[PDB]
Ligand binder design. Structure first.
Ligand SMILES: [Zn+2]
Length: 269
DNA sequence: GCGAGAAACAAAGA
DNA sequence: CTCTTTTTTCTCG
């Protein structure tokens, strides 16, 4: 998932599991708990979920007064809320069991991660990750963004994917944003003029906020599967279809190892 | 520091 | 059968 999908999951979880006491925690794939599964089980069993936050693509469970469970879903991690008697599915790895149901984490590629840290360690954790600002008018300062772009010869797509200029874009929304802002994904950032940087800045915020409002892009039933943003995608996965602005065919290339969808007319090299 | 390429892993498709 | 394709963080040179 990307930021809008993780936000959607966060909202659904906030509505449903906040106030629940964790009765037990079980793992078939304990190795995805990076801080140690048996340790997490000992610390969190019997604790109550107080809240669910998000930073970039990271989900943050607030559990008891002092614990933060940082969850990253990577490529295809999925959470679902199930009855206590629900049958195991092949790629289920972890479950948090409550009195009346269970939260199950599944991940076909086993990329997703859980790390248990303390409340006062959350800010240092994200500073160490070098995550940039949230994609909002309030947090995402255009002036710093512009100065970072001016100083770099990186290509704009890979630089945006780093999470350091702004948090939350993955392959789908970065392609969508660059199409919206009329910028070629291989454009060296020090070549971008002030007005293009402005349009890029605003387009990042607009696309991600629209995606959130629409409940994410659900591509292929787990939490956040009721999204509608996929119906608004202009380029990602649209190879051979026509650009909605100009009518040229959307092309797909490879940029820094990633599949990259763009309009060659609207996004001049 | 940089960019290229690839691994962690599994499945699906050519 | 092989090769390619689908978030983060590493090694390599
Ligand atoms: Zn176009």
């Amino acid at each position: 998932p990307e930021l809008p999908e993780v936000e959607t999951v966060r909202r659904e979880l906030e509505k449903r599991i906040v106030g629940q006491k964790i009765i037990s925690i079980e793992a078939t794939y304990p190795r995805m708990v990076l801080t140690g599964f048996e340790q997490l089980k000992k610390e969190l069993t019997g604790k109550t979920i107080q809240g669910i936050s998000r930073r970039g693509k990271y989900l943050i469970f607030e559990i008891g007064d002092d614990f933060r469970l940082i969850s990253h879903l990577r490529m295809e991690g999925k959470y679902r809320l199930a009855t206590l008697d629900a049958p195991r599915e092949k790629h289920d790895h972890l479950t948090m069991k409550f009195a009346d149901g269970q939260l199950i984490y599944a991940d076909v590629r086993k990329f997703g991660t859980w790390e248990l840290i303390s409340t006062d360690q959350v800010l240092p954790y994200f500073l160490k990750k070098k995550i940039g600002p949230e994609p909002t008018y309030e947090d995402f300062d255009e002036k710093l963004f512009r100065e970072k772009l001016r100083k770099s010869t990186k290509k704009i797509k890979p630089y945006l994917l780093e999470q350091t200029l702004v948090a939350g874009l993955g392959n789908i929304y970065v392609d969508e944003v660059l199409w919206l802002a009329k910028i070629h994904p291989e454009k060296e950032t020090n070549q971008l003029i002030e007005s293009s940087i402005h349009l890029l800045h605003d387009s990042i915020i607009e696309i991600l906020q629209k995606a959130i409002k629409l409940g994410g892009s659900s591509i292929r039933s787990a939490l956040g599967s009721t999204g509608k943003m996929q119906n608004e995608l202009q380029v990602y996965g649209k190879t051979g279809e026509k650009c909605s602005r100009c009518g040229a065919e959307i092309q797909k290339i490879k940029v820094a190892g990633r599949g990259t969808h763009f309009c060659p007319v609207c996004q001049q090299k």
